[model samples]
Target: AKLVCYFTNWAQYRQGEARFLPKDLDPSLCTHLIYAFAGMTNHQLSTTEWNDETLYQEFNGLKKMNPKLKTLLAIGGWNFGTQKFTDMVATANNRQTFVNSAIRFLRKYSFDGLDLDWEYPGSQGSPAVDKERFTTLVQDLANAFQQEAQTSGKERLLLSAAVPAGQTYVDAGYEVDKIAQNLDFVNLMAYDFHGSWEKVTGHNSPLYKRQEQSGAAASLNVDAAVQQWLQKGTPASKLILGMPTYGRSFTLASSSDTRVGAPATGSGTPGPFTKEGGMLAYYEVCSWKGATKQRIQDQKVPYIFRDNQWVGFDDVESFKTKVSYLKQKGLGGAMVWALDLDDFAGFSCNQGRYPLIQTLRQELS
Candidate 1:
């Protein structure tokens, strides 16, 4: 099984906190590490000044510690939006140009592979034709990589994509069978099912379905999303389930409201580390004080509720359950949304270093 973990290049910028640099990584912890977001401008791949060419060299250098480790550069993220991708994949010439540039970029940077993380192909400001264009893009990249590998006498570069979890995303953007055929594996972003966007409190990554809910709450659980992918023709062996390293927070509608579906007025306060409103890293959540913890029996996930605040997130126990589900379903493996979000340094959550990741590693092993 492959334990793929994402390492955000921008994480080192979290000032006055435990900034995550490549040196901080424990290479032995995961099989593969994906560097989040190499951007695109004017139809060419690029990186931030913070993540310039030198950093790429340093990031890939982690392989020195663990020869078995493989690293990939993820192109685009939620921040990159969809128009650039839609423009790039609109025509054959454009696709070929991007593919050629990608091959050269990967080779130049010494990355083992490339991970396409277009937020959505058809939705998120993408054109309707993206439904079919996305497939062609992957196919072209696969064919080009095969030829490049043969000519260079190097192993073929692995191609993978980060896809949306909801069936709406599947129906709107992907030709699952076709896309799956041209890639090494598909990373299903199964978390973020519910967050501050909705007025009702819900789990960030529920393992089971909530039969009593409707709309986003009802259709957005992990089980339903994974099953939908399988039923839509993505082989279970090629689907990597995503695990959250952070919690989604919301303000309770009233002090008396405390259940899963309790009404919410707004998001929770930002964490000192993450500094993002309505969300808290596992580290912060671990140290939360004066919050009452409870388990959602049907969903098999956990949450914490303070006087007027509710935050839903995954812990070691939930991770163990997810790892078991991964094996039981014969899925590809598990993936964390990011490495920095966890209690990597063990500053909080005194369950030893990388408690959540360690739990997944132990369970998967």
Candidate 2:
């Protein structure tokens, strides 16, 4: 089983309280640690942060401590756009450029794998034809990794992706069977079904479909997304369930008319540390002492609302509950969206450092 955890390069830039560096990581906690967002510049892999090379060293050095840890460099994110990926895979030669560079880069940096995080293909200004092109790209990368492993006498590099959970994205971006065949694992991004962009309040990552939801809306939960991937030809053992460390918040239209579907005019006030509108880190949510916390019983996750401010987030209880779901499905394991956003400092959530992740490891074990 793989317990894949992502750590953002930007997290080290946060202020005193929220900043997280590679050294802060407990190398033994996660089996695979994916470094989020290297860059896609001029159709080749590059570093995003100024200190990426230095950071990569520190991050990979964790393996010396654990000896069993595997590190991967993830390229692309929501903001990276699809055009870079589309342009790169538009030609076989171009795809080889990326593939060869990826191998060299991974080896140079001591990364055990390369995670293609193109934020999707065949959508968001990318050509529809890119759907098939993406398959070709992964197939090429996987074969290259295999060849390199045999020639160099080194362990093969892993190829996995952080995939979308939505029906439209899944259909538009992936040739599921083909991609699944090439990938060592698939990280199903099963969160963000609901966010402040909507006109109502909903959990950020509900474990199951709520009884009140209907139509396609009912299929927005984690269970449906997992099942949908399974039906689309992904093997259960190769799929990793995505878990979020942050929540989507909202400014309820009427505090009294509070329910799952209640109208929301705008996002809730951003937390001081996270400072992102319509969102709060799990650490921030844990400090809402005055808020009314309730378990959306059917969903198996909880939300905290007080006055007009509201947020839906995961706690230790929910993490363990989700692990049970992971166990039942016989999946590869759980992939936490981030290590930084979790309450890394024991003081913030007052539950040991990295409570959610620790709970998942314990429960999964």
Candidate 3:
């Protein structure tokens, strides 16, 4: 199990005072760790301020704890990732400058590798006007990183990306076949398949099923993503399945109807608790759950109903099912959306801490 622990904007880590890895974290279970949406902040990437001292301390501490740990500096994210991507890749000079800065930053801070979280290469919130330039940028970065790593006498740094799960993103990003060859791996953000944004209320993330295809419930879940990535020419071995630690909430037409894919009255948002109706961070939800004296099932994941509210989240059992599915598919292991979402014990409220990662290591080996 290659536990790729992810951290979000550097500012959050400092403001939140969260540890990169827990004191007792079993580093052996972790291979590579990354910070997500590395450049995104408050809906904009450029405005995001990174405190290098804080980041350096965190990276150094993790490395000291786990000598084999590999860290990557990831760039771009959902909100405004693709906006400046073309500009960043605009000219060879621009690409080289970015790559050199990345290399120097990593070496100066004692980290390793780079991860590109560009929301999409060609089409996304904003489309990449020149698709060919996207491929060229990746090629340039790969070459530069490899050369620097060789000269520096460190292990060649890994280069990976968090890609959109749809065909449009893949097609827009340029030739997947060639891009895959230049990078170390591709992290497919297979979650967010169905949410309150759609006309229906459905699973935030499903391991193997496709979203409903007709009526107001039409959507794409997990299998569609895995199949689509493979179809686009990315190999199973070089692909890492992305897992979401958090769940989505929705106001349903009724409580008895918890179909995997069904239209709901309104878009589901984060929740204050399993029963309360809105998005809640894992920490906040945990505190509420403990105070309310509610119980979570290891097998069923997080789902509750007191009157008419419903929330669904992934737990130990759900993670186990997902891990098994990934193994069966012969894919490259798992990558988490962020490490902070895990329970204080380091797992989900239902499954217990670390069980999912433990189960993955055991089964995958």
Candidate 4:
């Protein structure tokens, strides 16, 4: 089984919070640790700051502690947008340039692979042609990686992608089977099923479909999304189920109305640490006061309501069940949205550092 964790590069910026750094990582917790993103400039890879180069070295250096750990540099993110990838994959020459630059960057940083994190290929203001172009980009990268491995006498570099979970994004962006062939595995972003965007409160990462909701919302749970990918021809073994270490929060329409589907005016108040309205880290959720916790047995997720505030998130129990689901489905292990979001410092949860991740490791390992 492959247990992958994404380490966001910008997490160190969280003020007055436990600033997560490379040194804080417990390398034994994950089989593969992916650096969140390496930006692009003029069609070539670049680093955000000088310290990023030092951090890259220190992150990879964790292998000295756990020789089994492998690191990958993920390129692009939701904020990086789509046009750069579209333009780069538009031509064979452009693709080769990116492939070569990526190879050089990985080798220089001592990374084991590259993870493509393009938010969406066809949608997100990208050209419709990007659907096919994205596949070609993976193919070209795979071919180049193989040749480079042969020339360098090293193991073939791993190529993986972080993919969308929703059917609309999947249909617009990916040629599943073709793209899967060139990559080692696909990380399905199974979280973010619902959030503050909607007026009604719903699970952020429900394990099963909720029959009560209408239209697309009803069918947007994690199980259905995973099945969608499998039906689209992606091998089960090549799919890594994603789990969230955070929760989606919302303010209730009425303090007395604390039902699951209660209407909400907007997002819940921001956390002192996460500082994002409508979101709270698992650690913050753990220490939430005066909230009445409730569970959706059908969906296998939990939420809490207090003082007109509602938060939907995963926990140790939910993750244990999710690990079993991954095993039952015969899929690649699991991946977390980010390592920093979990109780990495073990300050709030009172369980231990990385409680959620540790649960997954214990079950999956």
Superposed Cα deviation of residue 317, candidate 2 (Å)? 1.1
- lDDT per residue for candidate 1 within 70-111, as digits (tens), equals 999999998888999999998778888888889999999989
Each model's C-alpha lDDT? Answer: 0.88, 0.90, 0.62, 0.89
| Sort order, lDDT high to low | 2, 4, 1, 3
Report how far off residue 257 is in candidate 3 (Å): 5.0
Residue-pair clashes per candidate: 0, 0, 12, 0
Q: Total backbone clashes of model 4? A: 0
Ranking by TM-score: 2, 4, 1, 3
TM-score winner between candidates 2 and 3: 2
Off by over 4 Å in 4: none
By lDDT, the best candidate is 2
TM-scores for all candidates: the values are 0.97, 0.98, 0.81, 0.98
- Candidate maximizing TM-score: 2
Q: lDDT by residue for model 2 over 200-309, one digit each (tens)?
A: 99989999988888989988999999998999999999999989999999999999977888899899998888888998999899888887988999999998898999
Q: What's the distance in Å from true for residue 23, model 3?
A: 6.2
Write candidate 3's Cα lDDT for 1-365 as tens digits. Answer: 46576765532442232333334345555588775444532222222444644654575568777787888767777775466776777677777767777766666766677788776777654455657776786787789888987787887767887787766667766577888898788888877765666665555666544322553223255666887787778988888888776666666777566554444677453443323344434544444342212223222234443333444556556677777777788788788776655553542345455555555556555
Return the lDDT, model 1, position 24. 69
Candidate 3: regions farther than 4 A off = 10-26, 40-50, 210-219, 253-263, 268-305, 346-362
The residue pairs in collision within model 2 are none
